[PDB]
Amino acid sequence: TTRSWDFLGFPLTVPRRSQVESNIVVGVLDTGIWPESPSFDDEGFSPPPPKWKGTCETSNNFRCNRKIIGARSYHIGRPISPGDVNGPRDTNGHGTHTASTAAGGLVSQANLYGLGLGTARGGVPLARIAAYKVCWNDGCSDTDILAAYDDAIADGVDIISLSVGGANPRHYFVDAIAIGSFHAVERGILTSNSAGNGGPNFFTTASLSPWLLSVAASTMDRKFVTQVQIGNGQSFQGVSINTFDNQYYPLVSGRDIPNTGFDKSTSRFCTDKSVNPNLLKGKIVVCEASFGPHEFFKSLDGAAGVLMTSNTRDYADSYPLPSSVLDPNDLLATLRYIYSIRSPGATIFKSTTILNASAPVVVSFSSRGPNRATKDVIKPDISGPGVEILAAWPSVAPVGGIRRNTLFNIISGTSMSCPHITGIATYVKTYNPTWSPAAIKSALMTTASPMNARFNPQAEFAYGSGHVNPLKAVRPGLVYDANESDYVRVWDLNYPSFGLSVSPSQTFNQYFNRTLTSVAPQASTYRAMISAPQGLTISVNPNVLSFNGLGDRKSFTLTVRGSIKGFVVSASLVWSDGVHYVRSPITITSL
Ligand SMILES: *[C@@H]1O[C@H](CO)[C@@H](O[C@@H]2O[C@H](CO)[C@@H](O[C@@H]3O[C@H](CO[C@H]4O[C@H](CO)[C@@H](O)[C@H](O)[C@@H]4O)[C@@H](O)[C@H](O)[C@@H]3O)[C@H](O)[C@H]2NC(C)=O)[C@H](O[C@@H]2O[C@@H](C)[C@@H](O)[C@@H](O)[C@@H]2O)[C@H]1NC(C)=O
Ligand SMILES: *P(=O)(OC(C)C)OC(C)C
Numbered sequence: 082t083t084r085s086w087d088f089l090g091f092p093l094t095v096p097r098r099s100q101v102e103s104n105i106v107v108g109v110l111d112t113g114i115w116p117e118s119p120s121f122d123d124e125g126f127s128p129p130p131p132k133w134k135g136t137c138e139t140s141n142n143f144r145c146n147r148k149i150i151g152a153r154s155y156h157i158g159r160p161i162s163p164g165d166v167n168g169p170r171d172t173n174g175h176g177t178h179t180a181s182t183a184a185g186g187l188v189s190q191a192n193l194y195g196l197g198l199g200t201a202r203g204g205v206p207l208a209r210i211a212a213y214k215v216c217w218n219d220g221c222s223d224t225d226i227l228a229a230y231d232d233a234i235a236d237g238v239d240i241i242s243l244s245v246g247g248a249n250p251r252h253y254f255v256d257a258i259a260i261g262s263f264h265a266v267e268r269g270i271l272t273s274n275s276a277g278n279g280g281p282n283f284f285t286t287a288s289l290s291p292w293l294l295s296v297a298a299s300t301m302d303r304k305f306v307t308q309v310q311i312g313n314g315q316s317f318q319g320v321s322i323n324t325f326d327n328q329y330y331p332l333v334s335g336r337d338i339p340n341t342g343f344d345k346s347t348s349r350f351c352t353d354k355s356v357n358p359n360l361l362k363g364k365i366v367v368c369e370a371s372f373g374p375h376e377f378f379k380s381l382d383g384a385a386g387v388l389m390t391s392n393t394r395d396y397a398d399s400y401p402l403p404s405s406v407l408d409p410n411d412l413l414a415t416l417r418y419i420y421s422i423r424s425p426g427a428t429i430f431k432s433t434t435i436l437n438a439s440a441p442v443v444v445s446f447s448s449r450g451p452n453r454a455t456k457d458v459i460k461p462d463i464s465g466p467g468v469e470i471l472a473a474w475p476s477v478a479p480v481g482g483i484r485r486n487t488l489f490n491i492i493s494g495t496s497m498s499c500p501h502i503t504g505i506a507t508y509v510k511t512y513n514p515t516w517s518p519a520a521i522k523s524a525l526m527t528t529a530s531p532m533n534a535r536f537n538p539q540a541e542f543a544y545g546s547g548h549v550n551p552l553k554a555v556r557p558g559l560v561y562d563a564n565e566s567d568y569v570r571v572w573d574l575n576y577p578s579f580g581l582s583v584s585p586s587q588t589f590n591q592y593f594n595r596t597l598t599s600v601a602p603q604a605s606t607y608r609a610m611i612s613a614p615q616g617l618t619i620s621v622n623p624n625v626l627s628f629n630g631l632g633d634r635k636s637f638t639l640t641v642r643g644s645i646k647g648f649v650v651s652a653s654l655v656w657s658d659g660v661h662y663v664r665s666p667i668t669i670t671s672l
Contacts, residue, residue, distance in 0.1 A: 083199025204504020298467025374482025558661025
């Protein structure tokens with residue numbers, strides 16, 4: 082966040098509408114909020130909007146200010162779970178992180194043990210925040226969500242950031258988030274929702290509702306790496322967020338030190354207590370696998386360092402001990418070294434950062450479509466920064482499995498990119514106070530910049546309409562407006578993109594209807610530009626539209642005939658008038 086915003090072309094110097102921005106309330110459903118964080122400072126803030134109706138649960142060591150003007154909790158079912166606390170207070174850290182990502186104010190020198198140093202901020206530092214705590218160690222219940230929504234709607238929230246939801250895509254018909262968001266939409270309130278972290282398989286996203294803006298997690302240029310240097314003098318580049326200073330320690334293999342009743346067939350991975358604690362103490366264990374902080378304590382208490390392995394390393398995480406996830410080969414290279422001189426040694430360095438030019442690429446865990454409820458309503462809808470995002474953290478909240486004196490943490494997930502979209506959507510809202518949820522969501526989609534299908538073969542079912550563009554989202558020129566009155570043919574649903582399910586090698590011919598509403602003051606003509614593959618034929622009538630002014634609408638029909646042989650084939654439509662550009666992806670699937 083000390084870097085994502087700049088990576089999105091959203092500088093500290095972007096123009097603002099401070100007056101409207103300061104009167105906007107961003108409701109955040111998550112694990113609560115930690116009031117004390119610098120990201121939620123009050124200084125200078127005028128008093129809350131007169132038309133705000135929310136309140137604050139201040140009977141248990143919590144206090145709202147003029148930044149955080151609302152805070153409530155929901156555990157309707159049974160009693161509070163173990164380790165949790167009564168009230169709006171965030172003890173998990175998830176809600177605090179999320180809130181600062183979307184609306185956190187400027188905090189300089191923001192850093193996690195030096196890592197990611199910079200100026201932390203939210204997309205809208207002046208908006209007010211209203212926290213609705215609905216997630217516990219107990220989980221997040223359906224009753225709490227519906228209830229929290231109700232309050233948000235009546236309190237007067239303007240937009241809602243929802244970083245929860247990952248149920249089996251097939252349980253989509255019994256998902257409450259669709260109920261809440263729907264009622265929210267009827268009152269002109271948009272919802273940003275993380276797609277899920279169940280990728281990369283072809284049908285892992287559970288954020289299926291149409292009125293819901295779904296967001297996937299992509300990378301940014303900045304990348305955390307941890308250099309490991311074994312005895313020979315050769316280095317390897319591993320990923321992890323290592324805050325421990327550079328140190329040197331003896332090396333050992335999991336196979337060489339099995340534990341009573343274990344075979345080296347499981348010791349390799351040194352998991353499930355398959356390693357003798359005695360011959361492990363004070364050394365950097367080398368294991369053929371990748372596990373979390375829990376397994377560190379469970380199986381490796383005593384070890385001074387850990388070296389893991391994985392074929393996937395497009396994101397980093399912090400651990401309880403000097404650690405680093407190496408590439409399969411660099412691992413074998415390290416193992417040989419162990420059986421070489423017999424008395425090895427490696428030095429795990431404190432993480433550093435490289436710049437990856439391929440970014441933004443949607444990360445591996447990001448849930449991807451098609452929409453299991455309707456393959457013709459493509460999802461995700463868009464992408465944003467969700468890998469290694471540094472933002473506000475509670476002082477009591479553990480980091481990577483231990484305690485660290487830090488006010489910021491670095492974590493990844495679709496729940497990190499959602500807040501980004503939430504903040505950007507609020508920004509657009511500050512400039513276009515009257516647009517509806519579908520209008521705001523359209524702006525961000527039609528104005529998103531195209532992503533590379535060579536990096537993410539799944540095309541749209543991985544990044545939807547592409548990567549967000551904050552400043553172009555403000556003046557989209559035209560919008561695919563809608564409202565609950567339209568969710569009562571699927572291909573004729575005024576969506577910002579087009580989808581179509583087909584059978585392998587089987588000529589087809591579909592047609593789609595849409596209506597664009599102008600949001601720009603000046604009249605202008607928008608000629609159309611298509612870009613379809615080979616085995617397909619696409620056209621649009623009209624292919625030229627004029628708009629006399631603000632409000633005017635026009636329709637058109639898109640036809641798609643052809644026959645794809647592969648799984649996913651994409652094309653695009655674009656309605657430019659010179660100044661404005663309005664692209665809408667076109668996806669065809671063989672499932
Ligand atoms: C700069 O960022 C890019 C984007 O994340 C890094 O490229 C990715 O690196 C990961 C990590 O190893 C690769 O993961 C393996 O992926 C394969 C196949 O799945 C991937 O590729 C196919 C075809 O392109 C797609 O259909 C999939 O959606 C997916 O993208 C899988 O079998 C393995 O089990 C791993 O999961 C990933 O493929 C790769 N994606 C892209 C777009 O290239 C890049 O990492 C470098 O390049 C990769 C290929 C490895 O050689 C890494 O070791 C390199 O570091 C990163 N570069 C730097 C400097 O960090
Ligand atoms: P986010 O990515 O939220 C999803 C589970 C919806 O989760 C964090 C804890 C990584």
